[PDB]
Amino acid sequence: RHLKSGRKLNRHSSHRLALYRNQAKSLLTHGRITTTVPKAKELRGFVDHLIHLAKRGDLHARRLVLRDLQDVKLVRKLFDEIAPRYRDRQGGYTRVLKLAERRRGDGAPLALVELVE
Amino acid sequence: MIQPQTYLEVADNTGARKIMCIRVLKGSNAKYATVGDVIVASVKEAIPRGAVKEGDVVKAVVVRTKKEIKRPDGSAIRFDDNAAVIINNQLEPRGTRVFGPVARELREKGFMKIVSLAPEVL
Amino acid sequence: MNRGALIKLVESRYVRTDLPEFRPGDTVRVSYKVKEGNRTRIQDFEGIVIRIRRNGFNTTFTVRKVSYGVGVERIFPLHSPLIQKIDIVQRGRARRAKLYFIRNLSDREIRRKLRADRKRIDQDRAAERAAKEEAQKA
Amino acid sequence: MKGILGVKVGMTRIFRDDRAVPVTVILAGPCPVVQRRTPEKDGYTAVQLGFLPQNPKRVNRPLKGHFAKAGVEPVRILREIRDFNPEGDTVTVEIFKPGERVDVTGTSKGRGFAGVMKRWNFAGGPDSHGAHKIHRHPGSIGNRKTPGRVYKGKKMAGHYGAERVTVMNLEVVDVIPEENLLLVKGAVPGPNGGLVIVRETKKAA
Amino acid sequence: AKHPVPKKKTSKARRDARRSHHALTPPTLVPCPECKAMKPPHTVCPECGYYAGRKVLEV
RNA sequence: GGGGAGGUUUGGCACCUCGAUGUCGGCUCGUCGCAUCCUGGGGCUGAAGAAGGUCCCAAGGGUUGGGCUGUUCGCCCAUUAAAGCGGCACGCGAGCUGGGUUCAGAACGUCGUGAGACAGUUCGGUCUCUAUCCGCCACGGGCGCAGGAGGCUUGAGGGGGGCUCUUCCUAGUACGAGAGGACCGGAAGGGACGCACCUCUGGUUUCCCAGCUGUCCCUCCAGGGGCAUAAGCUGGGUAGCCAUGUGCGGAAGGGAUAACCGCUGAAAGCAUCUAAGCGGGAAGCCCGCCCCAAGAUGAGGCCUCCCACGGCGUCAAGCCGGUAAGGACCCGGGAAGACUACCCGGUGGAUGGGCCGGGGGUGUAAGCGCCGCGAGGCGUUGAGCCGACCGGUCCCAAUCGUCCGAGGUCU
RNA sequence: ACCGGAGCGCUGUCUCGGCGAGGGACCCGGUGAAAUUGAACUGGCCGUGAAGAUGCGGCCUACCCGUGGCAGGACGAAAAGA
RNA sequence: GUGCAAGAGCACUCAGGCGCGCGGGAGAACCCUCGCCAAGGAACUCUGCAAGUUGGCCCCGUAACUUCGGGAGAAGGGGUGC
RNA sequence: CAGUGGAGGCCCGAACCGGUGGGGGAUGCAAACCCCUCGGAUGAGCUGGGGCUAGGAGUGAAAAGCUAACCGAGCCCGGAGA
RNA sequence: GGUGAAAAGAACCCCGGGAGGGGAGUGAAAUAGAGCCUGAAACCGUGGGCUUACAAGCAGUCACGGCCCCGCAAGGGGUUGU
């Protein structure tokens, strides 16, 4: 009984990881972001987790954040603007919602990350 | 799991020190023996001054195996090998010098002699 | 009736709340048994252990101990047949739990790779006649 | 040939007696009896059996709040014990006593379209020597020209999962009224927290 | 061009039927509140919108 | 010395096939046959018992694993209640193998003046991804069942399942000089096999945690990242997936029977187990058992639930537009699944995720003081992290709402 | 890097297979061939028949069409048989 | 460029170039190619075909035989990091 | 004997020739190719350039192999509508 | 190979990125609209008449029934339940 658990795929485990992380970077830079639905899902989960970590403020955590990510100014704006606002928020700081048309060329269900505040 | 084409070293005086697994006395489809079992045996490695030379074909009863078997109360037990005891065509431990811990499972089967001289039964 | 775990935890009239705390370091003394056509015995078993696998109900422990022949491996179901079972000197500072590398080289390297934490024995020293101080304070 | 409805939970090994016992528990609980059946207007002898209460608006309409006694509907609705006439009230769990053997019915979980090895069971073969092209494959099916037909029911590559089975001869060692549970020699089919009917065993009568 | 090769032509009607269970398929639309057009269900319309309707910058 | 049957062998024939019908054994997958090898029963015996022999009935289930040879056949091996024979293109190459075979090389023994050739041998040597119809196994869409919806059923027919060993007890009594050694019933374990299940056992986890290499970069230090697989390497590993693991299935019993053993009883005063009647009697037959299954065109049954004239058919069955039980579209999903379908929840809601707790995995981290010049290490510490998991929690995603839906044939 | 025989260690060759992998296979959209092809409306048994049939007799199972899958048969495709 | 006995080798990477002219979801059978495997250890097979164990550098050690060159990396074993 | 020196159709192995055991590919990336493993490896070596030898003729460390992807006699074209 | 007698070979508005079309307009004719005279079949479309979801086939023949369209009658063509 395969799949009988969860977790979406289609990449190298590494390629997966790097994709999630990147999407998080490009995200946190902006806030409202266009992607494909499955991506969008596992995305919103992952990033949400990271943001709840940001809700704290320990250096352990901080590096762990940028251990999964890259830019330092990004951790600045993370723990200086982003993390402060979503203080009271104990959940999904991201909201992803579907778009019409579908991804032209091969028809794919689209969706949009949101800042949610 | 002891099956044929397996090397088993004995745990007594004997006149042998290594015996290979031939067949099982069990039902003609039970290619599997373990604790307190009856295994026919070829002799592959023995020690000169002795009784059962190299090439002899006698019988045997396992005392010790690398695959622990669950005792009826859910608590198993393993001896790091594939050790047996030599027996004849009359169910008799040929030697007299049993070596190391046996399994009391043998005690229930009909090898009461071993159980006795067995130092640390488990 | 939802939480199946709730139910299984209500099956917990079956629990051992009186057993020596140990890590997969060492353990040692005694166990339980049967032995003979009426039962009647508790065959003592020491041991240097190997695995603690946690199941709540029956978090079982596999134990290594090398006797008069060679190495022997006995696993116990943490909760009934074993009466007191109680060990000798627990030991620890083990990095993993699964001591499988000991079925490779069981020798002086065994001794050369295990130190009990003194702090444990210091706790034992305190709790020794603090237990009489326990039989003294309210 | 009595019975009870039940949901699955647990599997352990309760070191009862002296040895050990793989113990699967089930919650029979307040499982209703909401309509008997009689020969002329039926043809058998039976009773419908409900289960777990949480049903509000999503159910409605016929209910059998009609029937003759309401009692609302569970939410896991109801099935049928054959050859069984009860005492009336919503039966519970203590229908059986610790010391009996029984039969137990339930769906087998879904392993879906599977390979003939993991199905009826075949063999396939040659990991190396032969080839690589027929590892997990059936090889043969039928004769040359006569038949020239492929045997009906020739154990073939297909589905193996979301089915159903009734097990015979188990041994319910425990039963707790206080929380409505029934503990047997662990053998239960189907996943945990699912559908399963208990009925008495068969042996010599 | 290997082992399996159609042995005798396939009749027109057969082609038809293979494509009988084929054929195109309808769409399905939903009314947009706080707006006046059609959208896919639970989606957002760049002409209508969701709650608040984010974007809606059509020229 | 006669008479047959069988169609496997070995031959005679040359009718389908020379615009091809790919020949051996083995793998895989079988199924049938009975002239039964094993297991029941029974007959007779130059049958005390034991075991044996032989003959009739009986295919339900079973027919093991290694050595040599390409080899089937055979012998051997250790065994088993048993190691049966045969058919199906001597089953099966659009299913595998290609070791054997009758391609081109070469040699070998060999015949030939010779090129070459020899039921004489030896070494090597390319089985062609895409299934159109049938057939088989799983799955749906349409229509069906002469009101419309849910829910619970009934069993037409069919499929599966049928094994089998040792041991203790009766009693070492019967028989037998003894050696041996029993029927009848009971009791306990075994093996192979089908079934289902993660509790225990153990493999499993593609990023759950740890140790680590050279490296390149953030940021010089610690620290942290990717590469090295499509996890760099190793040590461990929850859930779910599993077998060696684990609970179970073969029963009991009923009914008709074979071969055969019997009762009352004639023709033919006596006899008979039969030509009337009746009883015992098998792993065999029917059932009980498990599973499918009303497309059981004959659409069954039960329990409820909803109900006309609204516009053309006046009388005749329709036709057309929304409604009432209802059901669906889309979504959030699912120990469900190729798609579909089957199952669940959709704000009145815990369905995914996020959150917090529980378990469980890993094993004292990032950093802080502290000892050695130093690698490091004492302590802060069973900490930190945390994949599926038992659940709590509307923080966010299941918004809005759309469309199909009886107007109830007759005799 | 030529053909046997042996032995040790070693190992999924086997007992006997179980999970896992990504990539193809399967569903969404864009493009989209081939050999073969008398016409088809193509179940089975049992006989027949120029001797091996869905098409013939007798006599057969099963609503209509499809998706994934296997490969016994259509004396299967490619070779006017070496 | 750095590291390993060294190097036009290998692992990462300078600089330069590139992501290979369809993809998107699922997360079946099965297949390509790849990891782990219990306990038993060629029982598989025409055959250890294949896969795996061995693995580099300093030390130790080496048969019968021989055309004295060899066979020799014989085999068997010890270390290696900071 | 030591040191010296650096000889080899020497030794292990890149680039470089090959094509051995296997898997894959089979209307293929491909009218011979990919992956694993293999053998030459200072020599009978390998490689860029210009020149030569031919159809019963050459070229051959020798298969009747090569002479333009099919060689027991290349291709063409003519007797030839043999 | 071929517009047409002659280029008179399509200004203008319309939708559309164009592409191409809808009138206008050209001529006897644009069903002569630009490799366009005349447009067989295979060939794939579209509307309507008949028939088809218990059904065994070299597919039609023959008769009986019914449905639609013809015909003044009687007759007919088309269709297919059997």
PDB file of N, CA and C in Angstrom, chain E residues 2-59:
ATOM      1  N   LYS E   2       6.998  -4.260 -35.363  1.00  0.00           N
ATOM      2  CA  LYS E   2       7.651  -5.371 -34.685  1.00  0.00           C
ATOM      3  C   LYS E   2       6.677  -6.547 -34.565  1.00  0.00           C
ATOM      4  N   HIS E   3       6.702  -7.254 -33.441  1.00  0.00           N
ATOM      5  CA  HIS E   3       5.791  -8.373 -33.233  1.00  0.00           C
ATOM      6  C   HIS E   3       4.305  -7.990 -33.374  1.00  0.00           C
ATOM      7  N   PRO E   4       3.792  -7.099 -32.504  1.00  0.00           N
ATOM      8  CA  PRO E   4       2.349  -6.863 -32.618  1.00  0.00           C
ATOM      9  C   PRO E   4       1.986  -5.997 -33.813  1.00  0.00           C
ATOM     10  N   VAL E   5       1.232  -6.575 -34.739  1.00  0.00           N
ATOM     11  CA  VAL E   5       0.811  -5.865 -35.938  1.00  0.00           C
ATOM     12  C   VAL E   5      -0.671  -6.151 -36.218  1.00  0.00           C
ATOM     13  N   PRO E   6      -1.504  -5.089 -36.353  1.00  0.00           N
ATOM     14  CA  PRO E   6      -2.920  -5.249 -36.700  1.00  0.00           C
ATOM     15  C   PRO E   6      -3.119  -6.211 -37.867  1.00  0.00           C
ATOM     16  N   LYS E   7      -3.858  -7.270 -37.586  1.00  0.00           N
ATOM     17  CA  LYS E   7      -4.098  -8.334 -38.535  1.00  0.00           C
ATOM     18  C   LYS E   7      -5.500  -8.135 -39.092  1.00  0.00           C
ATOM     19  N   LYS E   8      -5.581  -7.567 -40.301  1.00  0.00           N
ATOM     20  CA  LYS E   8      -6.823  -7.033 -40.905  1.00  0.00           C
ATOM     21  C   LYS E   8      -7.199  -5.630 -40.419  1.00  0.00           C
ATOM     22  N   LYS E   9      -7.710  -4.819 -41.338  1.00  0.00           N
ATOM     23  CA  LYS E   9      -8.111  -3.440 -41.055  1.00  0.00           C
ATOM     24  C   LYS E   9      -9.070  -3.328 -39.876  1.00  0.00           C
ATOM     25  N   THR E  10      -9.084  -2.165 -39.235  1.00  0.00           N
ATOM     26  CA  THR E  10     -10.115  -1.844 -38.258  1.00  0.00           C
ATOM     27  C   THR E  10     -11.283  -1.115 -38.938  1.00  0.00           C
ATOM     28  N   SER E  11     -12.503  -1.596 -38.704  1.00  0.00           N
ATOM     29  CA  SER E  11     -13.689  -1.008 -39.326  1.00  0.00           C
ATOM     30  C   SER E  11     -14.013   0.370 -38.770  1.00  0.00           C
ATOM     31  N   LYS E  12     -14.580   1.217 -39.624  1.00  0.00           N
ATOM     32  CA  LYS E  12     -14.865   2.607 -39.280  1.00  0.00           C
ATOM     33  C   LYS E  12     -15.619   2.730 -37.951  1.00  0.00           C
ATOM     34  N   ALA E  13     -16.671   1.926 -37.809  1.00  0.00           N
ATOM     35  CA  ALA E  13     -17.531   1.941 -36.626  1.00  0.00           C
ATOM     36  C   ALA E  13     -16.752   1.704 -35.335  1.00  0.00           C
ATOM     37  N   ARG E  14     -15.753   0.838 -35.424  1.00  0.00           N
ATOM     38  CA  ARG E  14     -14.921   0.542 -34.277  1.00  0.00           C
ATOM     39  C   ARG E  14     -14.176   1.792 -33.831  1.00  0.00           C
ATOM     40  N   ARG E  15     -13.557   2.471 -34.802  1.00  0.00           N
ATOM     41  CA  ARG E  15     -12.862   3.742 -34.587  1.00  0.00           C
ATOM     42  C   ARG E  15     -13.806   4.705 -33.886  1.00  0.00           C
ATOM     43  N   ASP E  16     -14.997   4.804 -34.459  1.00  0.00           N
ATOM     44  CA  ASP E  16     -16.047   5.612 -33.893  1.00  0.00           C
ATOM     45  C   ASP E  16     -16.225   5.339 -32.415  1.00  0.00           C
ATOM     46  N   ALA E  17     -16.367   4.072 -32.033  1.00  0.00           N
ATOM     47  CA  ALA E  17     -16.672   3.709 -30.637  1.00  0.00           C
ATOM     48  C   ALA E  17     -15.539   3.948 -29.629  1.00  0.00           C
ATOM     49  N   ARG E  18     -14.350   3.473 -30.007  1.00  0.00           N
ATOM     50  CA  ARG E  18     -13.125   3.817 -29.292  1.00  0.00           C
ATOM     51  C   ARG E  18     -13.182   5.290 -28.963  1.00  0.00           C
ATOM     52  N   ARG E  19     -13.623   6.080 -29.940  1.00  0.00           N
ATOM     53  CA  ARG E  19     -13.831   7.502 -29.711  1.00  0.00           C
ATOM     54  C   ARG E  19     -15.228   7.862 -29.187  1.00  0.00           C
ATOM     55  N   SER E  20     -16.054   6.863 -28.891  1.00  0.00           N
ATOM     56  CA  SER E  20     -17.385   7.146 -28.375  1.00  0.00           C
ATOM     57  C   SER E  20     -17.180   7.448 -26.921  1.00  0.00           C
ATOM     58  N   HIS E  21     -16.398   6.605 -26.262  1.00  0.00           N
ATOM     59  CA  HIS E  21     -16.146   6.916 -24.856  1.00  0.00           C
ATOM     60  C   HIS E  21     -15.147   8.067 -24.682  1.00  0.00           C
ATOM     61  N   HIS E  22     -14.590   8.518 -25.810  1.00  0.00           N
ATOM     62  CA  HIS E  22     -13.726   9.697 -25.883  1.00  0.00           C
ATOM     63  C   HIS E  22     -14.601  10.941 -25.850  1.00  0.00           C
ATOM     64  N   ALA E  23     -14.584  11.688 -26.957  1.00  0.00           N
ATOM     65  CA  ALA E  23     -15.377  12.911 -27.140  1.00  0.00           C
ATOM     66  C   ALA E  23     -15.018  14.031 -26.166  1.00  0.00           C
ATOM     67  N   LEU E  24     -15.373  15.266 -26.504  1.00  0.00           N
ATOM     68  CA  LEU E  24     -15.064  16.381 -25.615  1.00  0.00           C
ATOM     69  C   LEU E  24     -15.943  16.368 -24.373  1.00  0.00           C
ATOM     70  N   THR E  25     -15.707  17.332 -23.491  1.00  0.00           N
ATOM     71  CA  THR E  25     -16.252  17.321 -22.140  1.00  0.00           C
ATOM     72  C   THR E  25     -16.647  18.742 -21.752  1.00  0.00           C
ATOM     73  N   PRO E  26     -17.765  18.899 -21.025  1.00  0.00           N
ATOM     74  CA  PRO E  26     -18.191  20.255 -20.657  1.00  0.00           C
ATOM     75  C   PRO E  26     -17.364  20.908 -19.558  1.00  0.00           C
ATOM     76  N   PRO E  27     -17.301  22.246 -19.579  1.00  0.00           N
ATOM     77  CA  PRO E  27     -16.814  23.023 -18.441  1.00  0.00           C
ATOM     78  C   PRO E  27     -17.961  23.232 -17.458  1.00  0.00           C
ATOM     79  N   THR E  28     -17.686  23.872 -16.326  1.00  0.00           N
ATOM     80  CA  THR E  28     -18.713  24.190 -15.338  1.00  0.00           C
ATOM     81  C   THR E  28     -18.347  25.477 -14.620  1.00  0.00           C
ATOM     82  N   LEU E  29     -19.272  26.427 -14.583  1.00  0.00           N
ATOM     83  CA  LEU E  29     -18.951  27.753 -14.063  1.00  0.00           C
ATOM     84  C   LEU E  29     -19.764  28.113 -12.825  1.00  0.00           C
ATOM     85  N   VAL E  30     -19.314  29.146 -12.114  1.00  0.00           N
ATOM     86  CA  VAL E  30     -19.998  29.651 -10.926  1.00  0.00           C
ATOM     87  C   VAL E  30     -20.096  31.177 -10.926  1.00  0.00           C
ATOM     88  N   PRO E  31     -21.225  31.699 -10.422  1.00  0.00           N
ATOM     89  CA  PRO E  31     -21.542  33.123 -10.268  1.00  0.00           C
ATOM     90  C   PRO E  31     -20.557  33.843  -9.353  1.00  0.00           C
ATOM     91  N   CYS E  32     -20.154  35.056  -9.727  1.00  0.00           N
ATOM     92  CA  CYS E  32     -19.262  35.843  -8.879  1.00  0.00           C
ATOM     93  C   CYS E  32     -19.982  36.944  -8.089  1.00  0.00           C
ATOM     94  N   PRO E  33     -20.039  36.791  -6.755  1.00  0.00           N
ATOM     95  CA  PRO E  33     -20.610  37.809  -5.867  1.00  0.00           C
ATOM     96  C   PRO E  33     -19.682  39.017  -5.799  1.00  0.00           C
ATOM     97  N   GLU E  34     -20.223  40.173  -5.416  1.00  0.00           N
ATOM     98  CA  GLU E  34     -19.466  41.424  -5.371  1.00  0.00           C
ATOM     99  C   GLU E  34     -18.814  41.705  -6.722  1.00  0.00           C
ATOM    100  N   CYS E  35     -19.539  41.347  -7.778  1.00  0.00           N
ATOM    101  CA  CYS E  35     -19.015  41.325  -9.135  1.00  0.00           C
ATOM    102  C   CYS E  35     -20.129  40.949 -10.107  1.00  0.00           C
ATOM    103  N   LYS E  36     -19.772  40.745 -11.372  1.00  0.00           N
ATOM    104  CA  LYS E  36     -20.753  40.365 -12.380  1.00  0.00           C
ATOM    105  C   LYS E  36     -20.122  39.611 -13.565  1.00  0.00           C
ATOM    106  N   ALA E  37     -19.727  38.359 -13.324  1.00  0.00           N
ATOM    107  CA  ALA E  37     -19.248  37.450 -14.375  1.00  0.00           C
ATOM    108  C   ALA E  37     -19.178  35.992 -13.892  1.00  0.00           C
ATOM    109  N   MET E  38     -18.471  35.150 -14.642  1.00  0.00           N
ATOM    110  CA  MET E  38     -18.346  33.738 -14.286  1.00  0.00           C
ATOM    111  C   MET E  38     -16.912  33.350 -13.950  1.00  0.00           C
ATOM    112  N   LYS E  39     -16.759  32.422 -13.012  1.00  0.00           N
ATOM    113  CA  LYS E  39     -15.432  31.930 -12.670  1.00  0.00           C
ATOM    114  C   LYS E  39     -15.479  30.429 -12.445  1.00  0.00           C
ATOM    115  N   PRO E  40     -14.317  29.774 -12.481  1.00  0.00           N
ATOM    116  CA  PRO E  40     -14.288  28.403 -11.976  1.00  0.00           C
ATOM    117  C   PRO E  40     -14.568  28.389 -10.474  1.00  0.00           C
ATOM    118  N   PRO E  41     -15.054  27.253  -9.960  1.00  0.00           N
ATOM    119  CA  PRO E  41     -15.539  27.179  -8.580  1.00  0.00           C
ATOM    120  C   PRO E  41     -14.424  27.277  -7.539  1.00  0.00           C
ATOM    121  N   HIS E  42     -14.605  28.179  -6.571  1.00  0.00           N
ATOM    122  CA  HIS E  42     -13.641  28.451  -5.492  1.00  0.00           C
ATOM    123  C   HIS E  42     -12.391  29.192  -5.945  1.00  0.00           C
ATOM    124  N   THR E  43     -12.375  29.570  -7.215  1.00  0.00           N
ATOM    125  CA  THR E  43     -11.232  30.244  -7.803  1.00  0.00           C
ATOM    126  C   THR E  43     -11.421  31.745  -7.648  1.00  0.00           C
ATOM    127  N   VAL E  44     -10.501  32.521  -8.212  1.00  0.00           N
ATOM    128  CA  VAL E  44     -10.610  33.969  -8.227  1.00  0.00           C
ATOM    129  C   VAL E  44     -10.689  34.444  -9.675  1.00  0.00           C
ATOM    130  N   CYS E  45     -11.486  35.483  -9.913  1.00  0.00           N
ATOM    131  CA  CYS E  45     -11.594  36.086 -11.235  1.00  0.00           C
ATOM    132  C   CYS E  45     -10.898  37.448 -11.235  1.00  0.00           C
ATOM    133  N   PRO E  46      -9.995  37.677 -12.208  1.00  0.00           N
ATOM    134  CA  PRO E  46      -9.305  38.967 -12.358  1.00  0.00           C
ATOM    135  C   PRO E  46     -10.277  40.071 -12.766  1.00  0.00           C
ATOM    136  N   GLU E  47     -11.494  39.666 -13.109  1.00  0.00           N
ATOM    137  CA  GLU E  47     -12.571  40.589 -13.425  1.00  0.00           C
ATOM    138  C   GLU E  47     -13.533  40.681 -12.243  1.00  0.00           C
ATOM    139  N   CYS E  48     -13.828  39.540 -11.625  1.00  0.00           N
ATOM    140  CA  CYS E  48     -14.587  39.531 -10.379  1.00  0.00           C
ATOM    141  C   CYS E  48     -13.626  39.541  -9.194  1.00  0.00           C
ATOM    142  N   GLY E  49     -13.556  38.419  -8.484  1.00  0.00           N
ATOM    143  CA  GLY E  49     -12.649  38.288  -7.357  1.00  0.00           C
ATOM    144  C   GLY E  49     -13.155  37.394  -6.238  1.00  0.00           C
ATOM    145  N   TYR E  50     -12.265  37.090  -5.298  1.00  0.00           N
ATOM    146  CA  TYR E  50     -12.616  36.350  -4.093  1.00  0.00           C
ATOM    147  C   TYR E  50     -13.158  37.349  -3.082  1.00  0.00           C
ATOM    148  N   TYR E  51     -13.102  37.009  -1.799  1.00  0.00           N
ATOM    149  CA  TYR E  51     -13.336  38.016  -0.779  1.00  0.00           C
ATOM    150  C   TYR E  51     -12.231  39.053  -0.912  1.00  0.00           C
ATOM    151  N   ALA E  52     -12.602  40.326  -0.795  1.00  0.00           N
ATOM    152  CA  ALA E  52     -11.700  41.456  -1.047  1.00  0.00           C
ATOM    153  C   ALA E  52     -11.195  41.537  -2.492  1.00  0.00           C
ATOM    154  N   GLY E  53     -11.010  40.381  -3.127  1.00  0.00           N
ATOM    155  CA  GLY E  53     -10.545  40.311  -4.501  1.00  0.00           C
ATOM    156  C   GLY E  53      -9.205  40.992  -4.725  1.00  0.00           C
ATOM    157  N   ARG E  54      -8.115  40.280  -4.433  1.00  0.00           N
ATOM    158  CA  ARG E  54      -6.762  40.815  -4.609  1.00  0.00           C
ATOM    159  C   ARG E  54      -6.347  40.833  -6.082  1.00  0.00           C
ATOM    160  N   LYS E  55      -5.673  41.923  -6.465  1.00  0.00           N
ATOM    161  CA  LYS E  55      -5.240  42.265  -7.836  1.00  0.00           C
ATOM    162  C   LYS E  55      -6.242  43.144  -8.615  1.00  0.00           C
ATOM    163  N   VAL E  56      -7.102  42.504  -9.413  1.00  0.00           N
ATOM    164  CA  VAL E  56      -8.105  43.173 -10.266  1.00  0.00           C
ATOM    165  C   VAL E  56      -7.604  44.467 -10.938  1.00  0.00           C
ATOM    166  N   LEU E  57      -6.438  44.382 -11.572  1.00  0.00           N
ATOM    167  CA  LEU E  57      -5.859  45.522 -12.280  1.00  0.00           C
ATOM    168  C   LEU E  57      -5.886  45.336 -13.800  1.00  0.00           C
ATOM    169  N   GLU E  58      -7.054  44.958 -14.315  1.00  0.00           N
ATOM    170  CA  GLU E  58      -7.262  44.813 -15.753  1.00  0.00           C
ATOM    171  C   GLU E  58      -7.540  46.178 -16.393  1.00  0.00           C
ATOM    172  N   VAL E  59      -6.828  46.480 -17.477  1.00  0.00           N
ATOM    173  CA  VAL E  59      -6.927  47.782 -18.139  1.00  0.00           C
ATOM    174  C   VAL E  59      -8.183  47.890 -19.005  1.00  0.00           C
TER     175      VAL E  59
END
